[PDB]
Amino acid sequence: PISPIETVPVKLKPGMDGPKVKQWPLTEEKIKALVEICTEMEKEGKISKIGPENPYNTPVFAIKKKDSTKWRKLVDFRELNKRTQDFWEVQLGIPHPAGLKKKKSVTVLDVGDAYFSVPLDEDFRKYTAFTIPSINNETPGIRYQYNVLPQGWKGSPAIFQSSMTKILEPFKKQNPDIVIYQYMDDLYVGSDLEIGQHRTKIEELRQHLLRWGLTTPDKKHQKEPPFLWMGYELHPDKWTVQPIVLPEKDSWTVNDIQKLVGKLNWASQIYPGIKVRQLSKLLRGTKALTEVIPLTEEAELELAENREILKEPVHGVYYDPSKDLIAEIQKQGQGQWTYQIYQEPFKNLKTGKYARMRGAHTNDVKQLTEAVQKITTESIVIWGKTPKFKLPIQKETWETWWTEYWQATWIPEWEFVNTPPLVKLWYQLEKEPIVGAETFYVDGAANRETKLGKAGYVTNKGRQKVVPLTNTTNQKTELQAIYLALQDSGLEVNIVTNSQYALGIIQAQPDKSESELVNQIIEQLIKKEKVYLAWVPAHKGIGGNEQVDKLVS
Amino acid sequence: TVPVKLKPGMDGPKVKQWPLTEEKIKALVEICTEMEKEGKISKIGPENPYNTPVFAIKKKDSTKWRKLVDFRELNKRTQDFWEVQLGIPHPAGLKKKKSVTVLDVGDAYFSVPLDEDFRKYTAFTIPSINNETPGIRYQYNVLPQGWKGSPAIFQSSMTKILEPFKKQNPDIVIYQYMDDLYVGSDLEIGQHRTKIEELRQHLLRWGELHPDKWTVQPIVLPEKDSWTVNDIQKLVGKLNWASQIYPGIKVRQLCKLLRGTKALTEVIPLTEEAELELAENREILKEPVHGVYYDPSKDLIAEIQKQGQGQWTYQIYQEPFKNLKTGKYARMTNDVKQLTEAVQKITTESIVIWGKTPKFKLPIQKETWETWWTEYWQATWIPEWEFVNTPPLVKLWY
DNA sequence: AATTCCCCCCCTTCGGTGCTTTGCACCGAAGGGGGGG
Ligand SMILES: Nc1ncnc2c1ncn2[C@H]1C[C@H](O)[C@@H](COP(=O)(O)OP(=O)(O)OP(=O)(O)O)O1
Ligand SMILES: [Mg+2]
Ligand SMILES: [Mg+2]
């Protein structure tokens, strides 16, 4: 029934009226389902008949519920939402079973008719008016208005969550030794005490809820393991995701590729080693969601690997506050990382992957730091404490990186682990000039009208060469000049440039880039054994740097 | 109460609450539980569209958690600040005092009720561990701590309690920026503490800085006998940039030995023209640049740089290439902790000197800063910071 | 050619912003997908 809880005062945005949308022609089965539903609801006072005094209207339809033989009646409140006042949602995240503790007794409850058991503000009911049609336009239609929270309204979820919290507060105040994970209307009540006392307390909770209108039907009340909770199968000592079925097709469209990447990201939290880089690359540049895309022999290998991985049943474990959180990170190549958070060896609380590509140019250390931050900020949410990392990076490499980088870098308490692919810096630029090495005065120019440029590398011993470039801006010509200086040189080399752009790219030791020129720079830099890069102001009378300026111009 | 109002045509704070550590949550639902019994805060629902981040900080050797609300955004749109808008207008003699002390008048703001039509903006949400329950929303009934309008309202209650104290001791200058009392005396340190407890006793009954050690750090050129081609090349670049900040620097006598396509590790034969130009340019760098004046109509900008081995460097300025103050913070392992301590020291120096927190430009990635900056913060106020990515050009500040 | 609403996540695209280097690198919002109620 309708709860005696107080009604949250809602109002429209200033200067806005109510919706006046018209009803679409509905199908016969949906019309019959709506008429059947809007009769039981009307008898219980959840909706009320109206007439000419109400000029508002909003389309209504009915989708099929997750369980068959039941219809969910929704209202297309898309013009009312544009005029409703703003809300601050109180749901800040999603509970995870890895953060649960090992409770001796567990019960999962589901409130029946969750939204239709919370009253709606009396001054806001006139706007939520709708019109059930008559079948074959026999009658002109029956108009109703909502006395409870509508489904499809912007403010309904927050209002219901706050009402449920207020309802549950006295019970949790009386019983502080019982854990209750609430998510909308799904309740996970876990506690100590034997099965008899736990069932007695569950009955007390159900009576308390029934005193507040909310009813918990016996069909949605689970008392024995496994418990289907929030997409997971909670067990007494482990947990698992509900079975994931990947699409199996011989012709892949654009839309069905992202219906496979999405189900792999979800599966990549208890399943270790899931990669979606090659599959996701297939979505770059596509236009239509029905465009057939052929697999590129690299997405097929990833698909086979992920299909093999999903074939073995894996399980998680529950949190233990009297134990230490450990997180291991491993490299996968091409900027992909796989991490697992555990407390005991070979018993993972959680798994995950990080493959985001931030910035045009990067290296392994920066991506490892980003993965560390992501894991830290996720573990803070789930367990409320940072874990101890076991990174695949040497202490000396991290030291040489953070004591020489021009940015503040820190990662928490961490221990080096030696598991093949290691994070390292491929090349380093010497801070001092190298004696007995040819000094390379490079420059590059490009007219900003016809997109023609030239590069020059005139050096100490007398060597010089000017190379023309087509369709290059003022920066690509400089990068080409550096590339050509690096190419025609021995092992030890000193390169002096006149702009900050190339230095800023090169100084932060990139090992992979989104531009082919910087990539060629990187593969050349690793080949050399000693490189010294220096800056010089361009048009300040500096000979050599000015001699090459004439050469490139 | 006072009719607090926002700027013409401004909505209000709508910031998302960041996740908190389990220690900062167990010690935040306890503070807020007791704060609600006394009526300081009250529960609200989702019908209030506004929000503000909240977190707890354990102050210096206090062994107690203190709730801190990041009112940075609400300060920007409040703009009431009219009741004695000056807020104890900045005494120019505060920076010249031998020693000043910072005292936190915290529980004094929790006695004057906040205007009813304003408590909706001072709303915050307390997160839950593993999202067990939806966040608990609260709003302030009394004047909050950290909001710029709290000192501006409590002004005609602190100038009265301090009246029988600062009248007996005219040689003490007391400043209150946001929530802290900057009492700047001039006596001996031993007598300074005695003069502090008397003020503390005065505060109770009626309900360690040293600004004498601050100076600007100028750019210094190296002094070496052997001069290689690279060395002049670095100096020319440094002098070329130094010209725009130190007008009158000439490089004609120095941008002449770099003429040609010679080597870069050979020793240059320094001439008399360069030698005279070197000494002349050094003397201009000796005296700090004059002609710069603080304009209270424009906001200050800070710029921290990392120099390694724990050394940092900042340049507080209002317009580019016109520095009002430069300094070097030494080390006090951790990198974010040092930067966090650097921001507090610069902010404390800026408040003492100009009374305004500068707009910082941190040399750190955003995701690294927001993850850890609340762990080492220990000050009531929070400055507005912007993140930058600029490699060191020519090492032009150290 | 079906039409709804909130929350978290990932992946790609496009426009705005800042510095100057009138291109180029970053960032955030919006589209798609997954999961939950
Ligand atoms: N597709 C949806 N569109 C709009 N609101 C939804 C949707 N799914 C769920 N909700 C909201 C409204 C529901 O009242 C609330 C709880 O979901 P759910 O438990 O599935 O429904 P219910 O409690 O109304 O019916 P039941 O009797 O089957 O429990 O979540
Ligand atoms: Mg359900
Ligand atoms: Mg239900």
Q: Which residue has the tokens 């069909």?
A: A219
Please tell me whether B179 is known to bind a ligand: yes
With CA of A499 and C1' of each nucleotide, the nearest comes out as: C21
**Residues A536 and A447 grouped into a single domain:** yes
Least Cα separation, residue A219 to chain B (angstroms): 24
Start-end of H helices in A488-532: 500-507, 516-527
Radius of gyration of chain B (CA): 25
**Inter-chain CB proximity B265 and A377 less than 8 Å:** no
Report CA dihedral (A81, A83, A87, A91) to the nearest 10 degrees: 10
**Inter-chain CB proximity B134 and A99 less than 8 Å:** no
Q: Which residues of A touch B366 (CB under 8 A)?
A: none
Helix (H, G, I), strand (E, B) or coil at A216: coil
CATH hierarchy code of domain B22-213: 3.10.10.10
Q: DSSP secondary-structure letter at B160?
A: H
Contacts of residue A176, Cβ cutoff 8 Å, sequence gap at least 6 = none
Q: Is residue A455 part of a domain?
A: yes
- The pair of structure tokens assigned to B189 is 């340190």
Q: Which residue has the tokens 């002349």?
A: B280
| In contact, A257 and A267? CB cutoff 8 Å | no
In 10 A of CB A61, how many CB atoms?
18
CA distance A442 to A459: 8
Chain A within 8 Å of B307 (Cβ-Cβ)? no
Q: Is residue A144 part of a domain?
A: no
Phi-psi region of B138 (alpha: psi -120 to 50; beta: other; left: phi over 0): beta
Q: Is residue A315 part of a domain?
A: no
Give the C-alpha distances (Å, rounded to integers) separating A373 from A340, A410, A411, B171, B369: 14, 10, 8, 51, 10
Q: DSSP secondary-structure letter at A87?
A: -
Helix (H, G, I), strand (E, B) or coil at B118: helix
Contacts of residue A68, Cβ cutoff 8 Å, sequence gap at least 6 = none
Q: Is residue A182 part of a domain?
A: no
Q: Which domain holds residue A527?
A: 439-551
Least Cα separation, residue B134 to chain A (angstroms): 5
Q: Is residue A372 part of a domain?
A: yes
CA distance B343 to A408: 13
Q: Which residues of B touch A535 (CB under 8 A)?
A: 237, 393-394
Q: Which residue is nearest to nucleotide C4 (CA to C1')?
A: A152
Interface test with B, best of A6, A92, A159, A166 (most B CBs within 10 A): A92
Q: Which residues of A touch B264 (CB under 8 A)?
A: 433, 439, 460, 494, 496, 534
CA distance B269 to B257: 8
Please tell me whether B299 is known to bind a ligand: no
**Least CB–CB distance from B233: residue in A165, A434, A534:** A534
CATH code, domain with A361: 3.30.70.270
Sign of the Cα torsion A413, A418, A423, A426 reads positive
CATH code, domain with A481: 3.30.420.10
**Least CB–CB distance from A441: residue in B46, B261, B309:** B261
Contacts of residue A291, Cβ cutoff 8 Å, sequence gap at least 6 = A253, A254
CA distance B287 to A52: 85
Question: At A528, which amino acid appears?
Answer: K
**Structural domain spans, chain B:** 22-213, 229-286, 304-387
Q: Angle, nearest 10°, between helix axes B366-376 and A364-383?
A: 50
Number of structural domains found in chain A: 3
| In contact, B229 and A545? CB cutoff 8 Å | no
Sign of the Cα torsion A526, A528, A533, A538 reads negative
Q: DSSP secondary-structure letter at A208?
A: H
With CA of A279 and C1' of each nucleotide, the nearest comes out as: C11
CA proximity to B45, closest of A160, A356, A187, A299? A160
Contacts of residue A66, Cβ cutoff 8 Å, sequence gap at least 6 = none
CA distance A458 to A511: 27
Chain A within 8 Å of B288 (Cβ-Cβ)? no
| In contact, A62 and A71? CB cutoff 8 Å | yes
Q: Which residue has the tokens 């270790």?
A: A272
Do strands A186-191 and A178-183 pair parallel, antiparallel, or not at all (unpaired)? antiparallel
CA distance A8 to B31: 27
Q: Using the 3D structure, point to which of A346, A379, A402 is the last residue of a domain.
A: A402
Q: Angle, nearest 10°, between helix axes A364-383 and A395-402?
A: 100
Chain A within 8 Å of B47 (Cβ-Cβ)? yes
* DSSP string over B335-363: SHHHHHHHHHHHHHHHHHHTSS--BEEES
Tell me the sheet residues that pair with A538: none
Chain A within 8 Å of B378 (Cβ-Cβ)? no
Q: Is the peptide bond before B247 cis (omega within 30 degrees of 0)?
A: no
| In contact, A440 and A463? CB cutoff 8 Å | no
| In contact, A339 and A305? CB cutoff 8 Å | no
* DSSP string over A306-326: HHHHTTS---B--B-TTS--E
| In contact, A74 and A151? CB cutoff 8 Å | yes
**Residues A379 and A338 grouped into a single domain:** yes
With CA of A259 and C1' of each nucleotide, the nearest comes out as: C33
Least Cα separation, residue A273 to chain B (angstroms): 25
Please tell me whether B180 is known to bind a ligand: yes
According to the 3-state scheme, what is the secondary structure of A111-179? CECCHHHCECCHHHCCCCEEEECCCCCCCCCEEEEECECCCCCCCHHHHHHHHHHHHHHHHHHHCCCEE
**Residues A331 and A292 grouped into a single domain:** no
Q: Is residue A66 part of a domain?
A: no
**B229-286: CATH superfamily:** Reverse transcriptase/Diguanylate cyclase domain (3.30.70.270)
**Inter-chain CB proximity B47 and A408 less than 8 Å:** no
In 10 A of CB A247, how many CB atoms?
10
CA proximity to B361, closest of B315, B303, B293, B322? B303
**Residues A443 and A547 grouped into a single domain:** yes
**Residues A529 and A449 grouped into a single domain:** yes
CA distance A192 to A171: 16
Structurally, at CATH architecture level, domain B304-387 sits in 2-Layer Sandwich (3.30)
CA proximity to A111, closest of A218, A199, A233? A218
Q: Which residue is nearest to nucleotide C10 (CA to C1')?
A: A265
**Inter-chain CB proximity A380 and B21 less than 8 Å:** yes
CA distance B83 to A59: 53
**Residues A501 and A532 grouped into a single domain:** yes
- Count residue pairs from A and B with Cβ separation < 8 A: 203
Q: Secondary structure of chain A: what % helix, strand, coil (to 5)?
A: 30, 25, 45
Task: Supply angle C-alpha B179, B181, B187, rounded to 5.
Answer: 170
The domains spanning B22-213 and B229-286 adopt the same CATH topology: no
**Residues A461 and A518 grouped into a single domain:** yes
Q: Which residues of B touch A547 (CB under 8 A)?
A: 260-261
Contacts of residue A119, Cβ cutoff 8 Å, sequence gap at least 6 = A2, A3, A5, A7, A147, A148, A149
- The pair of structure tokens assigned to A419 is 């598991």
Resolution in A, one decimal?
3.0
**Residues A447 and A490 grouped into a single domain:** yes
Q: Is residue A528 part of a domain?
A: yes
CA distance A160 to A166: 10
Do strands A492-497 and A439-441 pair parallel, antiparallel, or not at all (unpaired)? parallel
Chain A within 8 Å of B128 (Cβ-Cβ)? yes
In 10 A of CB B51, how many CB atoms?
23
